[PDB]
Amino acid sequence: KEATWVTDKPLTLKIHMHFRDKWVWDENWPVAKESFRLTNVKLQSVANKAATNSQEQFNLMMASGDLPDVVGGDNLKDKFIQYGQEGAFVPLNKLIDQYAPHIKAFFKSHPEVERAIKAPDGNIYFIPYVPDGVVARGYFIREDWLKKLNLKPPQNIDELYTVLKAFKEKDPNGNGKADEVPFIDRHPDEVFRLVNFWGARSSGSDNYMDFYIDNGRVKHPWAETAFRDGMKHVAQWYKEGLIDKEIFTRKAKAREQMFGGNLGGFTHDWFASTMTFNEGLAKTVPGFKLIPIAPPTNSKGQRWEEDSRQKVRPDGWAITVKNKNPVETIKFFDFYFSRPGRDISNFGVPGVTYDIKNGKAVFKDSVLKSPQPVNNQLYDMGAQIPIGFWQDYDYERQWTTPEAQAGIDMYVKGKYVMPGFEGVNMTREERAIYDKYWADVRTYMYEMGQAWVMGTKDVDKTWDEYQRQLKLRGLYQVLQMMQQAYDRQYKN
């Protein structure tokens, strides 16, 4: 018997969980075993390990009619809410208020998370994966190059331009060639984020090309005239070779290639992984050193870091109408918002991956020193998976180098990070319009954006037509449904 036991008699629940198009709940997972030991509730996987399309597997199950007790996975928010409104998933509101003290208190102190997951009928149909942490990407620059060229780190957009041209013109790698590529980035979409430097937004959240809220108004950044003026500068920079010619194609290994080759000297990427190149390249590129910098003041006079971590993920789990043990299940869910539950779901298994020290879960050196990334070690154990749980940033702090952490603290202290838009949940009516036109509009914008950057089309010559096409393709109907849903969810 454990102090955390949910039931006096061992309870086995059937769960369908398929996530990341490759994994399913594995009851042989060390964490799954520990979870059962601590709650007296065991999860039995009815999902198909061999299936390679998680979203599809969800549908075949839903159609199947024969439902399990619990359904979990990533990117299921939308489906949880729709199949919840037509009665397949049990509303959790009352269940939480009476049997989940930890979940209850969490929502109480994190109202924004609660709003974000509320279906249009006001019900809560799933417990979400709550991530921890605020800073996402940041700006990094070659300090050794600034060193050679004898320049100080840029404080505003003017100096930034000066510095990047220096990088391309004054041969910092000194191989007597003009082979330097100032801005590189493994995520092509980051090139559009550059418009931030001219007071224009490129997205309302960490998701690329997302809507944002401006004075209670749902808007799309790519449709604003601000974006037009920003793109003009971006296209000029591309024309001058300040931006990687292959920005749209290099992708994934851009850092290894460009940094390893000693060609690039500036990027916008995640703190942890980007800073590791300082160590992994000490050998191959002597003196190589990237430093995080506060975002240079933009033309409007402010420091902008548009990217941030979402406060809630569209992942989690729900209770089906067929679950004959709703209160035991909810108490079980609640365990994952309690410290002991947060411990195993974030750190793994005591004695194996961590140990309690000073009342804190502390990873073993073997775990931190391994070339295998901590996240992957945990996934293989059933930890850091898309069930409904409260993530603990301290697990991440432990494998983030001191230099990266200092950079992150600087961003938090600087208050440059803009709050992201957590999205809205739409009714059938609304969703119908969105699903019919959004994708078309989005791809259209992306194609024009790409052409504008590459100079394939002049922005000023095509802006009026671009605006015309946006209205013609449904932008306005999409926004109206977004606005309607927004007013209902955030203004009621």
Binding residue ranges for Ca(2+): 133, 171, 173, 175, 177, 179-180, 436, 440
Distance of alpha carbon 118 from its chain centroid, rounded? 20
End-to-end CA distance of the chain: 46
Contact predicate 203/306, CB 8 Å = yes
Closest CA to 292 of 410, 414, 398, 194: 410
458 CB contacts (<8 Å, ≥6 apart)? 452
> Which CB atom, from 179 or from 487, has the smaller least distance to Ca ion?
179
Q: Which stretch binds Ca ion (CB under 5 A): 127-135, 174-182, 204-212, 340-348?
A: 174-182
173 scored as a contact of Ca ion (CB under 5 A): yes
Contact predicate 269/186, CB 8 Å = yes
- At residue 392, φ and ψ (nearest 5 deg) are -120, 105
Q: Least CB distance from residue 148 to Ca ion, whole Å?
A: 11
Contact predicate 199/207, CB 8 Å = no
Number of residues that bind Ca ion (CB under 5 A): 5
Q: Least CB distance from residue 453 to Ca ion, whole Å?
A: 24
Q: Least CB distance from residue 177 to Ca ion, whole Å?
A: 4
Strands 137-142 and 41-45: unpaired
Q: Which residue has the tokens 């931030």?
A: 196
Question: Of residues 262-291, which lie at the interface with Ca ion (CB under 5 A)?
Answer: none
> Which CB atom, from 87 or from 287, has the smaller least distance to Ca ion?
287
Three-state SS at 289? coil
Q: Which stretch binds Ca ion (CB under 5 A): 8-16, 142-150, 178-186, 362-370?
A: 178-186
Three-state SS at 27? coil
Q: Least CB distance from residue 285 to Ca ion, whole Å?
A: 13
Q: Which stretch binds Ca ion (CB under 5 A): 139-147, 155-163, 177-185, 195-203?
A: 177-185
> Which CB atom, from 261 or from 419, has the smaller least distance to Ca ion?
261
171 scored as a contact of Ca ion (CB under 5 A): yes
261 scored as a contact of Ca ion (CB under 5 A): no
179 scored as a contact of Ca ion (CB under 5 A): yes
Q: Which stretch binds Ca ion (CB under 5 A): 95-103, 165-173, 193-201, 395-403?
A: 165-173
> Which CB atom, from 240 or from 403, has the smaller least distance to Ca ion?
240
How distant, in Å, are the alpha carbons of 55, 331, 381, 382 from that of 46? 15, 22, 19, 16
> Which CB atom, from 166 or from 344, has the smaller least distance to Ca ion?
166
Q: Least CB distance from residue 276 to Ca ion, whole Å?
A: 25
Question: Of residues 11-40, which lie at the interface with Ca ion (CB under 5 A)?
Answer: none
Cα 7 to Cα 17: distance, rounded to the nearest angstrom: 23
Among 108, 152, 177, 357, binds Ca ion (CB under 5 A): 177
Q: Which residues are annotated as a binding site?
A: 133, 171, 173, 175, 177, 179-180, 436, 440
Q: Which stretch binds Ca ion (CB under 5 A): 38-46, 179-187, 425-433, 465-473?
A: 179-187
Contact predicate 190/234, CB 8 Å = no
> Which CB atom, from 175 or from 375, has the smaller least distance to Ca ion?
175
Among 52, 175, 225, 376, binds Ca ion (CB under 5 A): 175
357 scored as a contact of Ca ion (CB under 5 A): no
Cα 308 to Cα 418: distance, rounded to the nearest angstrom: 7
- At residue 319, φ and ψ (nearest 5 deg) are -110, 120
Q: Least CB distance from residue 179 to Ca ion, whole Å?
A: 5
> Which CB atom, from 172 or from 382, has the smaller least distance to Ca ion?
172
> CB under 8 Å, gap of 24 or more: what pairs does 398-401 form?
398/362, 398/363, 398/368, 398/374, 399/272, 399/363, 399/368, 399/373, 399/374, 400/271, 400/272, 401/272, 401/275, 401/276, 401/279
Query: Which tokens is 376 given?
Result: 């992957």
Closest CA to 449 of 211, 219, 69, 194: 194
Q: Least CB distance from residue 258 to Ca ion, whole Å?
A: 13
> Which CB atom, from 144 or from 190, has the smaller least distance to Ca ion?
144
Q: Least CB distance from residue 168 to Ca ion, whole Å?
A: 9
Q: Least CB distance from residue 186 to Ca ion, whole Å?
A: 22
Cα 302 to Cα 338: distance, rounded to the nearest angstrom: 40
> Which CB atom, from 173 or from 400, has the smaller least distance to Ca ion?
173
Please report, as ranges, the residues that interact with Ca ion according to CB under 5 A.
171, 173, 175, 177, 179
